[PDB]
């Protein structure tokens, strides 16, 4: 029942059906496993179809508390209070919850993206304004029976997928569930140990993979690494796509890289595996990134003689982000009550007739260092 139930605009997110209030408002809200605040719009806004009315709701309570929440991209600043929530396409229960109502904003709301606030995922640790802003899925968790687990299977302008809350559906994926711990609950941070580009290692120190932290993020579109690991990746990626040459630009995501239409050569490039952590001592499983995930396709009818693309791996100072382009194709299981994160290969998983996305393992290192950076 709960299959298909996320909807999307490549690029900017994907979002479930909420209602907000009694009477219920119905609301798109973005999932959101990188942060841990529940923030609908309440205020007319150029990019809002429509809003939370608060006044409408006879179960609103006001918390007489103003909160602020600046994310990698956009902000927001609102008014907190709580209401009764419920989801139409998950979990057939009603929860009140802490709910922000955004009053003002910038770079936040995306214009024509469908969706009207954000679900915030992860745990109280990163909520605003402090940890005592209990996020939603607690308040799920503790006010009804939900068994305390999630999982996501988003899949590659319209997009779509499902979240399931409260277990794993099996019709989801193939293959075999491989499971990193969860390093520390705040952000849902992992750890990497290992990359390869085609293959080949990268060859540094596992720490700075994880510099200064890693975490799977919902979102976030791309995948983000921190700067050393960043320059290494898109040296070697150059290298096995040297057959031709695209502008720097392209590189830094600043622009786009066309071609006539259906002659994309997906096999020059690269196929990116990351290693994480396992859950046995110097063990680890790899998932393998096709092009087809991190050469984002970019919508526009004025180009669409050609298939376009964004670079959709970037630079980050705040350590590496898993984000969308990493997750489609794979579904991914927050197993919150054991405190691991699954990975297996999606049912929309991606592939052309020569390679395919994969979870596998097991792989061992002789290397005893710990690969987290704190
Ligand atoms: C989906 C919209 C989007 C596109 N892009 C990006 C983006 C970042 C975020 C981003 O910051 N997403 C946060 C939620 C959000 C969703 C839609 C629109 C605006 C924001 C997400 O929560 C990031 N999670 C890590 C984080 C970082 C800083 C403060 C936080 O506070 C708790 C959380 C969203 C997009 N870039 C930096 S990118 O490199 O992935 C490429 C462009």
Redesign the pocket.
Known sequence: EMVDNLRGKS???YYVEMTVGSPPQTLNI?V?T????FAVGAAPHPFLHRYYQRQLSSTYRDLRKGVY??????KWEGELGTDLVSIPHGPQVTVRANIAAITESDK?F?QGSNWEG?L?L?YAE?A?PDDSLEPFFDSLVKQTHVPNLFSLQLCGASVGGSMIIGGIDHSLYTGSLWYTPIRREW?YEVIIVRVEINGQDLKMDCKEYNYDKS?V?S????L?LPKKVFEAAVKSIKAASSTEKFPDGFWL?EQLVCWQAGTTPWNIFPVISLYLMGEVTQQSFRITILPQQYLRPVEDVATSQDDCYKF?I?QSS?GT?M??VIMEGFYVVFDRARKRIGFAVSACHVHDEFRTAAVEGPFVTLDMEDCGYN
């Open positions: 690029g900017q997110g973005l959101d990188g942060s841990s605040n929440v600046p994310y990698t991209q956009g936040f995306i954000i915030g992860a990163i605003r952000y975490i993020d979102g976030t579109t791309n983000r995501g959709a970037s705040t982000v984000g969308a």
